[PDB]
């Protein structure tokens, strides 16, 4: 019975840091997302720019670690990288190649 | 097929932590700046997760009016993410729609 935290973003993976691992083994993949669209607002269209760090886990973190040059649809939730951080990050639950 | 833009969709249920005095573009349009404060438990790789998030946000025109006095109110908000300012490194939520949370 959750409180809604849903982002879907289509965006080019701009940078993908070498893959890493929790002490427990799980694959962790840090990423920078560069987004760039025209959205509707109060009647007119808007150039939107957005660069946002993001993180992928486990299986998809390995299938995707090699894809710096690519455009993806991404679904997840927003969170602050590290308590006391004042900076939000996207925690990806699912990641397709954009074909929208 | 799709003439839609590139997908930029946030739905977020948060607390209106701060609502700045309402301002106005030179053209008249009402602008309401806000700080949103979300807490929740999300699922990730089979584990429950405590998530804390404080995010600036911004409404326009009509709803900017109805929402200027909601200090301690909890809302579902819908919009898209964007960098306030050039190079700000700091994202914000631009709300297309806001209503009282019901879940």
From Swiss-Prot, chain A:
PROSITE patterns: SSB
Regulation: PriA:PriB complex-catalyzed duplex DNA winding is inhibited by CGS 15943 (CHEBI:131351); PriA is the drug target.
Mutation effect (residue 34 to A): Significantly lower single-stranded DNA-binding activity. No effect on the levels of DNA unwinding activity of PriA
Alphabetic keyword roster: DNA replication, DNA-binding, Primosome
SUPFAM superfamilies: Nucleic acid-binding proteins (SSF50249)
Any one of the GO CC terms: pre-primosome complex
Residue ranges constituting the SSB domain according to the UniProt record: 4-99
InterPro entries assigned to the protein according to its UniProt record, in alphabetical order: NA-bd_OB-fold, Primosome_PriB/ssb, Prisomal_replication_PriB
Coiled-coil boundaries: none
GO biological process: DNA replication, synthesis of primer
GO MF term set: ATPase activator activity; ATPase binding; double-stranded DNA binding; protein homodimerization activity; single-stranded DNA binding
Reported function: Stimulates the DNA unwinding activity of PriA helicase, which does not seem to require single-stranded (ss)DNA-binding by PriB. Activates DNA-dependent ATP hydrolysis catalyzed by PriA. Weakly binds ssDNA. Weakly binds double-stranded (ds)DNA, a partial duplex DNA with a 3' ssDNA overhang, and a forked DNA structure with fully duplex leading and lagging strand arms in vitro. Involved in the restart of stalled replication forks, which reloads the replicative helicase on sites other than the origin of replication; the PriA-PriB pathway is the major replication restart pathway. During primosome assembly it facilitates complex formation between PriA and DnaT on DNA; stabilizes PriA on DNA. Stimulates the DNA unwinding activity of PriA helicase.
Subunit structure and binding partners: Homodimer. Component of the replication restart primosome. Primosome assembly occurs via a 'hand-off' mechanism. PriA binds to replication forks, subsequently PriB then DnaT bind; DnaT then displaces ssDNA to generate the helicase loading substrate. Interacts with PriA with high affinity, independent of DNA presence.
Family: Belongs to the PriB family.
Protein name: Replication restart protein PriB
Gene symbol of the encoding locus: priB
Curated annotation (Swiss-Prot), chain B:
Classification via InterPro entries: NA-bd_OB-fold, Primosome_PriB/ssb, Prisomal_replication_PriB
Keywords on record: DNA replication, DNA-binding, Primosome
Gene Ontology cellular component annotations, sorted alphabetically: pre-primosome complex
Result, substituting residue 24 to A: 1.3-fold lower single-stranded DNA-binding activity than wild-type
Gene Ontology biological process terms, A to Z: DNA replication, synthesis of primer
Regulation: PriA:PriB complex-catalyzed duplex DNA winding is inhibited by CGS 15943 (CHEBI:131351); PriA is the drug target.
Residues of the SSB domain: 7-102
Keyword Cell membrane tagged: no
Pfam family, one: SSB_1
GO molecular function per UniProt: ATPase activator activity; ATPase binding; double-stranded DNA binding; protein homodimerization activity; single-stranded DNA binding
Family: Belongs to the PriB family.
Primary role: Stimulates the DNA unwinding activity of PriA helicase, which does not seem to require single-stranded (ss)DNA-binding by PriB. Activates DNA-dependent ATP hydrolysis catalyzed by PriA. Weakly binds ssDNA. Weakly binds double-stranded (ds)DNA, a partial duplex DNA with a 3' ssDNA overhang, and a forked DNA structure with fully duplex leading and lagging strand arms in vitro.
Assembly and binders: Homodimer. Component of the replication restart primosome. Primosome assembly occurs via a 'hand-off' mechanism. PriA binds to replication forks, subsequently PriB then DnaT bind; DnaT then displaces ssDNA to generate the helicase loading substrate. Interacts with PriA with high affinity, independent of DNA presence.
The protein, known as: Replication restart protein PriB
